[PDB]
Design a protein around this ligand. Structure first.
Ligand SMILES: [Zn+2]
Ligand SMILES: [Zn+2]
Length: 71
């Protein structure tokens, strides 16, 4: 029973921007379930999430999207 080296999904933060855009502009769906997304990945902030349970399920497929800054 050791932590070893395992990558876990980070919690989704609540996005709030007004300077650029007024709601989303580009895309507006949850990567996991696709039903109205209003939060972002606290890590890369690239993927869209609506809940913690959604992020975990999609986390397997997020492994290649996280840690890639913006390219
Ligand atoms: Zn969702
Ligand atoms: Zn991420």
């Amino acid at each position: 029973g050791s932590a070893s080296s395992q990558v876990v999904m980070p919690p989704l933060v609540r996005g709030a921007q007004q300077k650029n855009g007024r709601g989303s502009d580009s895309s507006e769906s949850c990567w996991n379930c696709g039903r109205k997304a209003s939060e972002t990945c606290s890590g890369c902030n690239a993927a869209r999430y609506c809940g913690s349970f959604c992020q975990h399920r999609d986390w397997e497929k997020h492994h290649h999207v996280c840690g890639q800054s913006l390219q």
